[PDB]
Design a protein around this motif. Structure first.
Motif, PDB file in Angstrom:
ATOM      1  N   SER A  69      92.965  76.907  54.773  1.00  0.00           N
ATOM      2  CA  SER A  69      93.460  75.686  55.395  1.00  0.00           C
ATOM      3  C   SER A  69      93.015  75.573  56.849  1.00  0.00           C
ATOM      4  O   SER A  69      93.127  76.530  57.619  1.00  0.00           O
ATOM      5  CB  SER A  69      94.983  75.622  55.317  1.00  0.00           C
ATOM      6  OG  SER A  69      95.487  74.579  56.134  1.00  0.00           O
ATOM      7  N   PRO A  70      92.510  74.397  57.228  1.00  0.00           N
ATOM      8  CA  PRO A  70      92.137  74.205  58.637  1.00  0.00           C
ATOM      9  C   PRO A  70      93.349  74.120  59.537  1.00  0.00           C
ATOM     10  O   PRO A  70      93.314  74.610  60.674  1.00  0.00           O
ATOM     11  CB  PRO A  70      91.346  72.885  58.624  1.00  0.00           C
ATOM     12  CG  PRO A  70      91.227  72.479  57.167  1.00  0.00           C
ATOM     13  CD  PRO A  70      92.329  73.172  56.435  1.00  0.00           C
ATOM     14  N   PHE A 113      96.263  75.579  59.144  1.00  0.00           N
ATOM     15  CA  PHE A 113      96.859  76.897  59.347  1.00  0.00           C
ATOM     16  C   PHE A 113      96.180  77.630  60.496  1.00  0.00           C
ATOM     17  O   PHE A 113      96.845  78.293  61.299  1.00  0.00           O
ATOM     18  CB  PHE A 113      96.772  77.731  58.068  1.00  0.00           C
ATOM     19  CG  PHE A 113      97.746  77.317  56.991  1.00  0.00           C
ATOM     20  CD1 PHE A 113      98.571  76.213  57.157  1.00  0.00           C
ATOM     21  CD2 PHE A 113      97.843  78.049  55.815  1.00  0.00           C
ATOM     22  CE1 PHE A 113      99.468  75.841  56.163  1.00  0.00           C
ATOM     23  CE2 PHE A 113      98.735  77.679  54.818  1.00  0.00           C
ATOM     24  CZ  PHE A 113      99.546  76.573  54.993  1.00  0.00           C
ATOM     25  N   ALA A 114      94.852  77.533  60.581  1.00  0.00           N
ATOM     26  CA  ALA A 114      94.135  78.173  61.679  1.00  0.00           C
ATOM     27  C   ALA A 114      94.557  77.594  63.020  1.00  0.00           C
ATOM     28  O   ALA A 114      94.758  78.335  63.991  1.00  0.00           O
ATOM     29  CB  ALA A 114      92.628  78.022  61.484  1.00  0.00           C
ATOM     30  N   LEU A 115      94.707  76.272  63.092  1.00  0.00           N
ATOM     31  CA  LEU A 115      95.119  75.655  64.346  1.00  0.00           C
ATOM     32  C   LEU A 115      96.535  76.069  64.720  1.00  0.00           C
ATOM     33  O   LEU A 115      96.817  76.331  65.893  1.00  0.00           O
ATOM     34  CB  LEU A 115      94.992  74.134  64.245  1.00  0.00           C
ATOM     35  CG  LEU A 115      93.560  73.650  64.012  1.00  0.00           C
ATOM     36  CD1 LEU A 115      93.521  72.142  63.798  1.00  0.00           C
ATOM     37  CD2 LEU A 115      92.666  74.040  65.183  1.00  0.00           C
ATOM     38  N   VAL A 127      97.979  78.917  63.901  1.00  0.00           N
ATOM     39  CA  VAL A 127      97.965  80.322  64.305  1.00  0.00           C
ATOM     40  C   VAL A 127      97.512  80.452  65.753  1.00  0.00           C
ATOM     41  O   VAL A 127      98.108  81.196  66.543  1.00  0.00           O
ATOM     42  CB  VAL A 127      97.078  81.144  63.352  1.00  0.00           C
ATOM     43  CG1 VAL A 127      96.763  82.507  63.958  1.00  0.00           C
ATOM     44  CG2 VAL A 127      97.779  81.330  62.013  1.00  0.00           C
ATOM     45  N   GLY A 128      96.454  79.731  66.127  1.00  0.00           N
ATOM     46  CA  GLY A 128      96.003  79.781  67.509  1.00  0.00           C
ATOM     47  C   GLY A 128      97.033  79.217  68.466  1.00  0.00           C
ATOM     48  O   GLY A 128      97.272  79.778  69.539  1.00  0.00           O
ATOM     49  N   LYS A 152      99.819  81.991  68.501  1.00  0.00           N
ATOM     50  CA  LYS A 152      99.462  83.302  69.035  1.00  0.00           C
ATOM     51  C   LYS A 152      98.937  83.230  70.461  1.00  0.00           C
ATOM     52  O   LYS A 152      99.113  84.186  71.225  1.00  0.00           O
ATOM     53  CB  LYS A 152      98.424  83.985  68.141  1.00  0.00           C
ATOM     54  CG  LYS A 152      98.910  84.275  66.721  1.00  0.00           C
ATOM     55  CD  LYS A 152     100.294  84.913  66.703  1.00  0.00           C
ATOM     56  CE  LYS A 152     100.234  86.433  66.681  1.00  0.00           C
ATOM     57  NZ  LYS A 152     101.593  87.033  66.518  1.00  0.00           N
ATOM     58  N   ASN A 153      98.292  82.133  70.844  1.00  0.00           N
ATOM     59  CA  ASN A 153      97.716  82.034  72.179  1.00  0.00           C
ATOM     60  C   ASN A 153      98.558  81.217  73.148  1.00  0.00           C
ATOM     61  O   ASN A 153      98.221  81.160  74.334  1.00  0.00           O
ATOM     62  CB  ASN A 153      96.300  81.454  72.108  1.00  0.00           C
ATOM     63  CG  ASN A 153      95.274  82.466  71.627  1.00  0.00           C
ATOM     64  OD1 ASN A 153      95.549  83.663  71.579  1.00  0.00           O
ATOM     65  ND2 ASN A 153      94.082  81.989  71.277  1.00  0.00           N
ATOM     66  N   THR A 191      96.262  70.606  70.313  1.00  0.00           N
ATOM     67  CA  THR A 191      95.347  70.882  69.208  1.00  0.00           C
ATOM     68  C   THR A 191      95.417  69.822  68.107  1.00  0.00           C
ATOM     69  O   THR A 191      94.399  69.525  67.468  1.00  0.00           O
ATOM     70  CB  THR A 191      95.647  72.282  68.643  1.00  0.00           C
ATOM     71  OG1 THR A 191      94.750  72.569  67.565  1.00  0.00           O
ATOM     72  CG2 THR A 191      97.076  72.357  68.132  1.00  0.00           C
ATOM     73  N   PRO A 235      88.082  77.303  58.352  1.00  0.00           N
ATOM     74  CA  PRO A 235      89.017  77.517  59.470  1.00  0.00           C
ATOM     75  C   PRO A 235      88.305  77.707  60.795  1.00  0.00           C
ATOM     76  O   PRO A 235      88.779  77.218  61.828  1.00  0.00           O
ATOM     77  CB  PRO A 235      89.792  78.774  59.048  1.00  0.00           C
ATOM     78  CG  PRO A 235      88.893  79.468  58.100  1.00  0.00           C
ATOM     79  CD  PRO A 235      88.217  78.370  57.341  1.00  0.00           C
ATOM     80  N   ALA A 283      87.418  74.279  62.121  1.00  0.00           N
ATOM     81  CA  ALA A 283      88.537  73.604  62.769  1.00  0.00           C
ATOM     82  C   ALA A 283      88.721  74.100  64.197  1.00  0.00           C
ATOM     83  O   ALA A 283      88.917  73.305  65.123  1.00  0.00           O
ATOM     84  CB  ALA A 283      89.817  73.815  61.960  1.00  0.00           C
ATOM     85  N   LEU A 284      88.658  75.419  64.397  1.00  0.00           N
ATOM     86  CA  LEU A 284      88.797  75.962  65.745  1.00  0.00           C
ATOM     87  C   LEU A 284      87.666  75.490  66.650  1.00  0.00           C
ATOM     88  O   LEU A 284      87.894  75.156  67.818  1.00  0.00           O
ATOM     89  CB  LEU A 284      88.847  77.489  65.690  1.00  0.00           C
ATOM     90  CG  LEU A 284      90.011  78.070  64.888  1.00  0.00           C
ATOM     91  CD1 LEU A 284      89.955  79.589  64.890  1.00  0.00           C
ATOM     92  CD2 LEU A 284      91.332  77.587  65.451  1.00  0.00           C
ATOM     93  N   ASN A 336      88.507  69.090  72.584  1.00  0.00           N
ATOM     94  CA  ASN A 336      89.591  69.123  73.558  1.00  0.00           C
ATOM     95  C   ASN A 336      89.246  69.892  74.827  1.00  0.00           C
ATOM     96  O   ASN A 336      90.033  69.865  75.779  1.00  0.00           O
ATOM     97  CB  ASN A 336      90.863  69.710  72.921  1.00  0.00           C
ATOM     98  CG  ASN A 336      91.587  68.704  72.029  1.00  0.00           C
ATOM     99  OD1 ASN A 336      91.366  67.500  72.140  1.00  0.00           O
ATOM    100  ND2 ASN A 336      92.462  69.193  71.151  1.00  0.00           N
ATOM    101  N   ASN A 354      88.941  81.143  74.415  1.00  0.00           N
ATOM    102  CA  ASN A 354      90.211  81.794  74.113  1.00  0.00           C
ATOM    103  C   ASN A 354      90.576  81.660  72.641  1.00  0.00           C
ATOM    104  O   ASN A 354      91.225  82.549  72.080  1.00  0.00           O
ATOM    105  CB  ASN A 354      91.309  81.193  74.989  1.00  0.00           C
ATOM    106  CG  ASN A 354      92.502  82.106  75.140  1.00  0.00           C
ATOM    107  OD1 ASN A 354      92.365  83.268  75.517  1.00  0.00           O
ATOM    108  ND2 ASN A 354      93.688  81.580  74.851  1.00  0.00           N
ATOM    109  N   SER A 358      92.243  84.426  68.354  1.00  0.00           N
ATOM    110  CA  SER A 358      93.233  84.268  67.299  1.00  0.00           C
ATOM    111  C   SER A 358      92.673  84.577  65.917  1.00  0.00           C
ATOM    112  O   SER A 358      93.420  84.527  64.936  1.00  0.00           O
ATOM    113  CB  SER A 358      93.804  82.848  67.315  1.00  0.00           C
ATOM    114  OG  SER A 358      92.808  81.909  66.964  1.00  0.00           O
ATOM    115  N   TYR A 385      94.646  85.459  62.470  1.00  0.00           N
ATOM    116  CA  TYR A 385      94.479  84.612  61.296  1.00  0.00           C
ATOM    117  C   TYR A 385      94.056  85.430  60.083  1.00  0.00           C
ATOM    118  O   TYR A 385      94.381  85.066  58.946  1.00  0.00           O
ATOM    119  CB  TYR A 385      93.462  83.502  61.578  1.00  0.00           C
ATOM    120  CG  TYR A 385      93.244  82.583  60.399  1.00  0.00           C
ATOM    121  CD1 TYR A 385      94.148  81.571  60.107  1.00  0.00           C
ATOM    122  CD2 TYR A 385      92.142  82.737  59.567  1.00  0.00           C
ATOM    123  CE1 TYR A 385      93.960  80.735  59.023  1.00  0.00           C
ATOM    124  CE2 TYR A 385      91.944  81.907  58.481  1.00  0.00           C
ATOM    125  CZ  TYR A 385      92.856  80.908  58.213  1.00  0.00           C
ATOM    126  OH  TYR A 385      92.662  80.079  57.132  1.00  0.00           O
TER     127      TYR A 385
END
Ligand SMILES: Nc1nc2c(ncn2[C@@H]2O[C@@H]3COP(=O)(O)O[C@H]4[C@@H](O)[C@H](n5cnc6c(N)ncnc65)O[C@@H]4COP(=O)(O)O[C@H]3[C@H]2O)c(=O)[nH]1
Lengths: 147, 140
Positions: free
Chosen positions: A1-2, A4-6, A8-9, A12-13, A95, B2, B5-6, B13, B94, B98, B102
């Motif tokens: 999932s895209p 879910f990655a966003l 998590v970041g 976590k960050n 995000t 994923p 997406a990051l 952004n 940064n 993550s 993940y």
């Protein structure tokens, strides 16, 4: 999932370091309310400007949190909306404003963005519960009211 | 996916509004070097501290970029390492830090896919001459 990655970041960050640092700084009951939009139009400039005006009206100011905790981190300063003299914070997850670009008819993509929003908060809520942070991390509506 | 997406969030952004703003501010040929690792051990706190001390040693300082552009964003003030007196910038992404949370070296697969998408977004926006990639030693 895209999404879910966003999430998590974002957790976590940003969320996790912020609340962990604030607790060590002495605050015993700090609250971070995370804006939880539902619809695509809540990600527009009109809704963002509404929230920014509302933050000002309720005496929130964008403030720094200096990080001193363990952990691999390229950024050591976090910025969070903080209520004046009060241990309450607010964030509009920046995000989320990348989801439309990621998905890219125009109406079909908006409904996919809304499904990604739902999944973002599904994962984010899971991470909050798995770290037993529900007393400090909650979700806010358009009016900065919990839930 | 994923990692895509990051990378999109990192570009949409951060990198793209930053370079667009400083160009709008009148910097004609600004340079942004993006740190690009490929081994997992480069995301450790020891390697990050070496990069930070190196940035300090090469006279980079966190610089404020105020976004006045068109577009929806909740965060209007960016911070980015800038070389003293020069239109030259550096960033350690940064968001890369993550990828372990993940998720062995499947992380290195995600890192390679992050930079494939990021490099693709730079090309598609005609920014190949302004935005490049750097190693641990701030070299292209
Ligand atoms: N209000 C607030 N939100 C934050 C902060 N740091 C992170 N966030 C949020 O977590 C997401 C992922 O953060 P990241 O640091 O792991 O990757 C970041 C980071 O790699 C980079 N970036 C954005 N703003 C930056 C900044 N001010 N300094 C350095 N890098 C930055 O772009 C990526 C995506 O940013 P974003 O706004 O879309 O999403 C953030 C953002 O929603 C923060 O300090 N304040």
């Amino acid at each position: 999932s895209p999404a879910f990655a966003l999430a998590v970041g974002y957790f976590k960050n940003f969320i996790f370091p912020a609340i962990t640092q604030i607790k060590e700084n002495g605050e015993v009951n700090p609250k971070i309310c995370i804006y939880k939009p539902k619809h695509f139009d809540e990600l527009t400039s009109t809704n963002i400007d509404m929230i920014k005006a509302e933050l000002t009206n309720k005496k929130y100011n964008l403030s720094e949190i200096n990080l001193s905790l363990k952990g691999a981190r390229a950024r050591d300063i976090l910025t969070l909306n903080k209520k004046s003299k009060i241990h309450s914070y607010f964030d509009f997850p920046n995000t989320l404003l990348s989801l439309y670009s990621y998905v890219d008819s125009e109406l079909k993509k908006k409904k996919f963005v809304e499904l990604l929003i739902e999944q973002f908060y599904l994962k984010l809520n899971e991470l909050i519960q798995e770290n037993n942070l529900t007393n400090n991390i909650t979700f806010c509506d358009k009016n900065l009211q919990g839930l």
